[PDB]
C-alpha cells in the first residue's frame, strides 16, 4: 500500500546556473515518486559510490525523506571528497554525513543539456578562521555535514583572484573579534562538470518517498485476512497475518 502523488521535480536543478561548492543548493523530497535513473540518464556519469546503502537500494527503496545537494565541481578534485580527505576543500566548503546512509555522484554535462548554464569559473574557499579579541590569536572554522561554510556570508559569489582576503568584525553575541576568509579559483573545462550529494533518512516519518510502481488487485489487505503474507506499507516491510 502506497499513496499516489507526483513525480519528483528536478527541473530547478536543470534550469539555471550551477551553485558553488561552499554555497550549494538543497532539494528536499517528501511524499514523492522518484526516479534516480531518469535523472542520471541526463548526465555522462563519471563515478557513483555509496556508503551504508547500496547503489541499488538508493534507487529502489522507500525513504522518510530524500535530500539532494547539488553544485558545480572540478572533476579533478575528487580526491578531497573522501570522508578521510586531506581537508583543502572538504573541511571548509562541503562535508557529508558519515552517520546517515549517503551517496556521491560525479558527472559531466553533455552538450545536449542546454537548459543548465555554464559558470565563469570554479571557486572554493581554502582558508576560513576566526580571530580573537586580541587580534593575534586565530582559530580555524570548519563546516559540518549539513551546514554551510561558517564564513559563507563573508565570501562573495565568486573568487575573483586567488588570495582575495575577506574580513568582518563580529558582534558581542559571538564573543567579538573578527571572522576572516580566503579562497582560490580553478579554470573551467570545455564542458560543465558537476557533483551531487544524496542523503537518505529513515524512520522519522512515513516512508512515502518511493519509486513509482503499478499494482494488481490481489495486493490489498482486504480478502487476505487470516493468511500469512509478506507486506510493504508506505516503506514499512515485513511478514505477518492481518
Amino acid at each position: 500500500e502506497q499513496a499516489e502523488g507526483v513525480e519528483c521535480d528536478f527541473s530547478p536543478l536543470l534550469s539555471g546556473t550551477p551553485p558553488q561548492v561552499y554555497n550549494f543548493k538543497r532539494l528536499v523530497f517528501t511524499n514523492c515518486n522518484y526516479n534516480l535513473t531518469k535523472l542520471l540518464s541526463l548526465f555522462s556519469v563519471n563515478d557513483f559510490t555509496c556508503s551504508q546503502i547500496s547503489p541499488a537500494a538508493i534507487a529502489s527503496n522507500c525513504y522518510s525523506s530524500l535530500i539532494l545537494d547539488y553544485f558545480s565541481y572540478p572533476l579533478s578534485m575528487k580526491s578531497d571528497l573522501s570522508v578521510s580527505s586531506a581537508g583543502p576543500i572538504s573541511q571548509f566548503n562541503y562535508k557529508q554525513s558519515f552517520s546517515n546512509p549517503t551517496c556521491l555522484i560525479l558527472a559531466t554535462v553533455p552538450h545536449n543539456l542546454t537548459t543548465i548554464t555554464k559558470p565563469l569559473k570554479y571557486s572554493y574557499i581554502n582558508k576560513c578562521s576566526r580571530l580573537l579579541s586580541d587580534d593575534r590569536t586565530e582559530v580555524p572554522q570548519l563546516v559540518n555535514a549539513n551546514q554551510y561554510s561558517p564564513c559563507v556570508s563573508i565570501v562573495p559569489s565568486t573568487v575573483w583572484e586567488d588570495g582575495d582576503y575577506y574580513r568582518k568584525q563580529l558582534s558581542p553575541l559571538e564573543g567579538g573579534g573578527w571572522l576572516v576568509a580566503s579562497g582560490s579559483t580553478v579554470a573551467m573545462t570545455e564542458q560543465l562538470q558537476m557533483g551531487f550529494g544524496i542523503t537518505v533518512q529513515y524512520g522519522t516519518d512515513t516512508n512515502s518517498v518511493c519509486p513509482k510502481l503499478e499494482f494488481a488487485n490481489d495486493t490489498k489487505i482486504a480478502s487476505q485476512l487470516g493468511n500469512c503474507v509478506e507486506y510493504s506499507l508506505y516503506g514499512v516491510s515485513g511478514r505477518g497475518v492481518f
Partner: antibody
Amino acid sequence: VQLLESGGGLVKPGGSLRLSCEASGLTFSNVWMSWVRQAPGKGLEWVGRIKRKSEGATTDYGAPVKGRFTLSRDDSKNTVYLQMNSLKIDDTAVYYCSTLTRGGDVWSSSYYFDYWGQGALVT
Amino acid sequence: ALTQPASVSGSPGQSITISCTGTSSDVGTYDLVSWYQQHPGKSPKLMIYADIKRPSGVSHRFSGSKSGNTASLTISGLQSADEADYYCCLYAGSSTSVIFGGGTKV
C-alpha cells in the same frame, strides 16, 4: 604615465626574441603589467600578464603563446620583459607593453587595461 | 568569445552604436566588459570599463549600454574625428584569459 618599449626586429621562425619596456609616472611595484599583440589585418590579442612582487609576481598567458612565451619584471629598474623562447611565423605582430588594474572592490571586481605603450614590431 | 558588427557608420552629428554580444557568463551576470578605441598606427585607448563608466580623458559622446547578454558602445553626436577601430574586451579575474572581439570599423 609613459611605457617605453623596444627590442623588436626580424627573427626567422625557429629562433627567439625578447622584448622589454620601461614604466615611468607610476609606482612600478604597485601595478600589474602585461602584453598584447596585433598582427596586420587582425584585432587585439592577449599575450600574458604578470603580478606584483608582493604577490609572488606570478604569470598567466594567452593560449596562442602557451608554453612558448615567458613574462618577468624587475622593480629595481621599473622594467618588464617578454621572452619568446620559440618564434613562429604567425608571431609577426606589433607588441604592446601595457598595465592592468582593477576597479570596484574584493566583493565585486572589474578588470581593465588603462595604459598602453608605443609598441614594437616583431617579425 | 565576443561578437561584434563588421562596421558601424553614420554622418557627423548622428547617433550610432557598436554591439558586443556573448552569453550569461560574458555580459549577462557581471558588468565587466570594456571598450577600446584604436587609431591606425597607434596603440588602443580605454573608452569605457566595467560596462558603466569612462576615464576622464574620454568625451561624453561615449556611453555604455547593456541588455540581456548584449553589451554595446553608444556614440552620441559622432564626429568625423571618431573614425577608428573599436574593440570590445572581456576579462574577469584569475583562471581565465582576456577575450577580445574582432573589432569594429567605425
